RNA sequence: AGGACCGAACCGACUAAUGUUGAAAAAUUAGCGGAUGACUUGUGGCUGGGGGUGAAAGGCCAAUCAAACCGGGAGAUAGCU
RNA sequence: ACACAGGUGGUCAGGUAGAGAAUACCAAGGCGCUUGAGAGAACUCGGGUGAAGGAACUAGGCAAAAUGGUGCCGUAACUUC
RNA sequence: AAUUCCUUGUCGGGUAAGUUCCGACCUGCACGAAUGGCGUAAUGAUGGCCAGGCUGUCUCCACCCGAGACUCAGUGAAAU
RNA sequence: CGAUGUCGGCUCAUCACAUCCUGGGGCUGAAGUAGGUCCCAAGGGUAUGGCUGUUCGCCAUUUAAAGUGGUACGCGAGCUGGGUUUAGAACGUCGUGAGACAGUUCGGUCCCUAUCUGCCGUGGGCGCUGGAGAACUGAGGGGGGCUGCUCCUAGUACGAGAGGACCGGAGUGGACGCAUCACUGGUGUUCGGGUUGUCAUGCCAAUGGCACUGCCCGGUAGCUAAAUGCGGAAGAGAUAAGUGCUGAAAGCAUCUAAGCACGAAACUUGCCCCGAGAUGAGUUCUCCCUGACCCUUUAAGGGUCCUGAAGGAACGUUGAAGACGACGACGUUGAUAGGCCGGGUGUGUAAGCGCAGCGAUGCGUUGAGCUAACCGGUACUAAUGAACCGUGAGGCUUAACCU
């Protein structure tokens, strides 16, 4: 349930530490991104020698949210914070090379197969 | 918007309702019959009859509880000592309403509510 | 309603082992890992139980790699292969939601032992 | 918001088209005391359906 | 084909072998008993009329009882007509079971939606509320402006305004039939249907593919 | 020690909602400034209308004030309605 | 103008908690405010709580929400010290 | 610039994006020395701008407790 | 000019089409992809932000698109009051000065209880020709009508290659709408618990009152969205622009003159809702009523006596029905409501007693006690025969049967 102005932690060695969502892509007037949806972010905080720098503007797939994900049997998987993984603009595809914290199987998404293949849990 | 909701707000707030019905189960019990508006009478049955029920079992717990509601020992004396054993074998409906016309000063529908045997 | 019970309890499990909020359970859950069905383990503290017949459920909280993961299971879903009590927990409160405001050390809950 | 023209007496009439009261037609007489009373209501001497309930 | 009348029992769920929770509306479908057939000849159209359930005799009227009597079926809570369709044929007194649907696959379900009483514009029409704050005077949930100016100089018919919402006929189309159990008078359809628990429903095979 | 600080009474009146045929011809409620000082208040006194008084706004001078109120000139005058 | 939510100087200062004449609860004393009875629609007023988000509102964070005590530790620029 | 018309001047900063803000430039339409000039610690219910927290301000509204509204009884207005 | 308040915003919209997107089509300096231009088309759809009072604009980032206009430059008895914005004040500039600016700057009261029209809801009356209960037919009216992306066909047609389709099919989304409460949650001042301060119930223990429900932690039913189900259609008809067949007028040509085939989100249908006050008041099924008298201007006349059905309605118990009316359930041959029993659920181990400890407090009895609107049962309580309204066989004419 991410929207414009939402802050997210990063889930990769991209160097971004805090990003802010400035657009929920994927449809006119579309209001929320969650599950594994692709938002557009600006970067509010990065480390000193990272692959990205603060004030950069690219995209990211969201991979963890406080709202979580429902499953075919009713159950829910929630997360304590909201996290995404930076993708570069004209390719989606992740900038980082490693992934942190758990991710959900919804990512099965062909193009995010990498993310799951990295990344500790679920 | 009410759907399936019980309980009558009697144009009061929660505490006041509680105070009044406490103050009025004690009345009906003391006098075995009292005259009130019809709505209050109908609600009274929900406060009072479960005191009676409670009194069908004498125990230090139940008396104390009875005292928590009511907060008056004469009355918790009467349930338990008299009323509990009266209604010992009757399953509920310890009370009965008799409608009885209209209040002069404001036209409120009145009714007597009385214990089912009185004699008093 | 009498029909509905008929329908519901003919769909309920008759071996949900006992547990209570504070307990630490390991839930084994069927999942399709790529091409494979296979059991998979989720272990954490039961911080809430919703008791409602076929709809009964429990929320199991667990600190995965630095931050929390809560999942609520649907006690009677075929997805839930088995439930196991790894440690009897001693708390007093139906819903242990205060543990969210707790990290690592303050999070710990006495063992029940008894 | 107030009227621009005075409404007519006829209109006053029509508006009161529905405030006739209705007389009751439900009085019954108690079998055991012969006082009138409304259906399902007690009598003024406290009779109801023959038995003398109340007693005030 | 024709449809039956039933009662909305409640909702629950059917868990599926492969870990899916299908949410279902439990509809009771006691046998429907034909109380009148109609044809071109006599009525100008073909259809069955049916009753279902039972009615306290003291609450059946002379006229109703007359009618029921004729078809020689016992009174039900009501009567409902289903349009016959060139081919379909039925006889007075015939009993129709829920097994009518043993297939069909989807069904349209009609009920009388729960009753929300006098609803304002926000609820009834999803009107979006004004500022709570910033100066608003007695105008949060109010409905805004309702016209233009001299031109119209009136309000247009069908204007979205506050009033009764709920408690009207509503159809919900193409719901999956999940189960048909005649022995039990059960029709399980996937998803919620109109009306509070206990009220009448009409199930017809879904008209749309 | 202090036209010192925080803060009740007391003095005030920055914001908002309510009220606007008001509970009230200026207020209520929540917040707000001063609160030993150029403070605040009781009683009585003095200044009078081209006059007063004014840490000055044309403020205030009995629900009012770029000239009070009352009575008079007076039926001012009204090429206007 | 009203049996008007306004205005009106002074004196008195009980108990518990409290720095306190704040504040909560009480004592003495005084009161329930001169239409009531029911309903539990919209909408208005006054409050409580609110998933995820967190100023994206708006002229403006207006309004809310938030902070809030005591004692230690400890506090930058700048400075008329 | 409480002063600048042209003007959202130009450049820099801050923002994802800043007709405002800050720092600069000097082309001051039309600053300037007790009609005081330029500074200035502290003070300020003073104006402008940023940020942390905070939130129903907002996405986008839900639910609940209360005074009206609504029904009965009594009284009984108003503008026009 | 004895008052037609205003820029922008908010809310709500409604038309036009000179069409922004989606649809059809002609030409193209159209290979494909993607464009250009024009014709047809108004069914639906048609952005959030930074800055500024702004509209606009510029900028950032979306989108299929971010249309242009009219509606007192739509909309202040609907909100706002930033701009405009009287009275205070200041700068600059003008003026000897009072002052002034169509320069700037800081501050700065937005009334109105709806009679009529209109509109949204909802009743009462009468009518529909004896009266009544139903179920209908369907004239008419309203709703709805949007679209991305991926996959197949196919790396195919096309192309030197880059790239990359038409037609058709399959999925899965966005926004929107409806319903629903099963799930996930919110709330849940009527359920349970903890706790601060104080007062009371003599005291202890145990309780209750007040302090925003004192403050909090949870939470049943219900309501509910963020929750989960469904929708937009396919099809059919007649068309627009357009593409054509046959074909003369005009030995040819010609889509047209006669004749014929096609052709779009527009139209009529198909889908949903209302719907016989459709006074052109329709149809079908069922139900009820089988006494006499008097008078007058003697006629579809007025009255009286007796009668009083079907049904309506009343009264009570009431409802996921509700402002009130209304609608539904039930009224003893009874589950309608309350109570009562059992169960669930919530809370989370009451009180009391005992044991340990100096004590706070622990442990045991104990998953205890309590537990609303819930589920399954149960006549204990309340739903008394009755009253009232509505009648007593139903006009004339013609026709077809019928004696
Ligand atoms: Mg109920
Ligand atoms: Mg009242
Ligand atoms: Mg309702
Ligand atoms: Mg809004
Ligand atoms: Mg106001
Ligand atoms: Mg308001
Ligand atoms: Mg006109
Ligand atoms: Mg001082
Ligand atoms: Mg104040
Ligand atoms: Mg002070
Ligand atoms: Mg004096
Ligand atoms: Mg004055
Ligand atoms: Mg003069
Ligand atoms: Mg004079
Ligand atoms: Mg003279
Ligand atoms: Mg004169
Ligand atoms: Mg008084
Ligand atoms: Mg007074
Ligand atoms: Mg005090
Ligand atoms: Mg009183
Ligand atoms: Mg709050
Ligand atoms: Mg919230
Ligand atoms: Mg939160
Ligand atoms: Mg934050
Ligand atoms: Mg904005
Ligand atoms: Mg903004
Ligand atoms: Mg504020
Ligand atoms: Mg506050
Ligand atoms: Mg500057
Ligand atoms: Mg900003
Ligand atoms: Mg100067
Ligand atoms: Mg100076
Ligand atoms: Mg209320
Ligand atoms: Mg009245
Ligand atoms: Mg006027
Ligand atoms: Mg056109
Ligand atoms: Mg051209
Ligand atoms: Mg205008
Ligand atoms: Mg106004
Ligand atoms: Mg201004
Ligand atoms: Mg709930
Ligand atoms: Mg004690
Ligand atoms: Mg008290
Ligand atoms: Mg209270
Ligand atoms: Mg030819
Ligand atoms: Mg219909
Ligand atoms: Mg129980
Ligand atoms: Mg039951
Ligand atoms: Mg007769």
Swiss-Prot record, chain A:
Cysteine disulfide partners in this protein: none
Record carries keyword RNA-binding: yes
CDD domains registered for this protein in UniProt: Ribosomal_uL14
A GO term from the CC aspect: cytosol
InterPro entries cross-referenced by the UniProt entry: Ribosomal_uL14, Ribosomal_uL14_bac-type, Ribosomal_uL14_CS, Ribosomal_uL14_sf
Keyword RNA-binding in record: yes
Gene3D superfamilies: Ribosomal protein L14
Superkingdom as given in the UniProt entry: Bacteria
One GO process term, biological-process aspect: cytoplasmic translation
Subunit: Part of the 50S ribosomal subunit. Forms a cluster with proteins L3 and L19. Forms two bridges to the 30S subunit in the 70S ribosome, contacting the 16S rRNA. In pre-50S ribosomal subunits interacts with RsfS, which may inhibit association with the 30S subunit.
Function per UniProt: Binds to 23S rRNA. Forms part of two intersubunit bridges in the 70S ribosome. In the 3.5 A resolved structures L14 and L19 interact and together make contact with the 16S rRNA in bridges B5 and B8.
HAMAP family: Ribosomal_uL14
NCBIfam families in the record: rplN_bact
PANTHER family according to UniProt: 50S/60S RIBOSOMAL PROTEIN L14/L23 (PTHR11761), LARGE RIBOSOMAL SUBUNIT PROTEIN UL14M (PTHR11761:SF3)
Name the UniProt record assigns to this protein: Large ribosomal subunit protein uL14
Gene source species: Escherichia coli (strain K12)
Annotated gene: rplN
Swiss-Prot record, chain B:
Entry keyword Ribonucleoprotein: yes
Keywords: Ribonucleoprotein, Ribosomal protein
UniProt-listed Gene3D superfamilies: Ribosomal protein L17
Naturally occurring in which organism (per UniProt): Escherichia coli (strain K12)
Any one GO molecular function term: structural constituent of ribosome
Keyword presence, Ribonucleoprotein: yes
Complex formation: Part of the 50S ribosomal subunit. Contacts protein L32.
Function: Requires L15 for assembly into the 50S subunit.
SUPFAM superfamilies according to UniProt: Prokaryotic ribosomal protein L17
Leader sequence segment: none
GO cellular-component term (any): cytosolic large ribosomal subunit
Biological processes, Gene Ontology terms: cytoplasmic translation; ribosomal large subunit assembly
InterPro entries per the UniProt record, alphabetical: Ribosomal_bL17, Ribosomal_bL17_CS, Ribosomal_bL17_sf
PROSITE patterns assigned: RIBOSOMAL_L17
Domain of life: Bacteria
Family: Belongs to the bacterial ribosomal protein bL17 family.
Protein name: Large ribosomal subunit protein bL17
UniProtKB/Swiss-Prot annotation, chain C:
UniProt keyword annotations, A-Z: Ribonucleoprotein, Ribosomal protein, RNA-binding, rRNA-binding
GO cellular component labels: cytoplasm; cytosol; cytosolic large ribosomal subunit
Record InterPro entries: Ribosomal_bL19 (IPR001857), Ribosomal_bL19_CS (IPR018257), Ribosomal_bL19_sf (IPR038657), Translation_prot_SH3-like_sf (IPR008991)
Family matches, as Pfam families: Ribosomal_L19
GO biological process terms, semicolon-separated: cytoplasmic translation; ribosomal large subunit assembly
Protein family according to the UniProt entry: Belongs to the bacterial ribosomal protein bL19 family.
Protein name: Large ribosomal subunit protein bL19
Species per Swiss-Prot/TrEMBL record: Escherichia coli (strain K12)
Gene responsible for this protein: rplS
Swiss-Prot record, chain E:
N6-succinyllysine: modified positions: 38
Keyword list, A-Z: Methylation, Ribonucleoprotein, Ribosomal protein, RNA-binding, rRNA-binding
GO molecular function annotation: rRNA binding; structural constituent of ribosome
Protein name: Large ribosomal subunit protein uL3
A single BP term in Gene Ontology: cytoplasmic translation
Record-stated family: Belongs to the universal ribosomal protein uL3 family.
Post-translational modification: Methylated by PrmB.
Role description: One of two assembly initiator proteins, it binds directly near the 3'-end of the 23S rRNA, where it nucleates assembly of the 50S subunit.
Entry-linked Pfam families: Ribosomal_L3
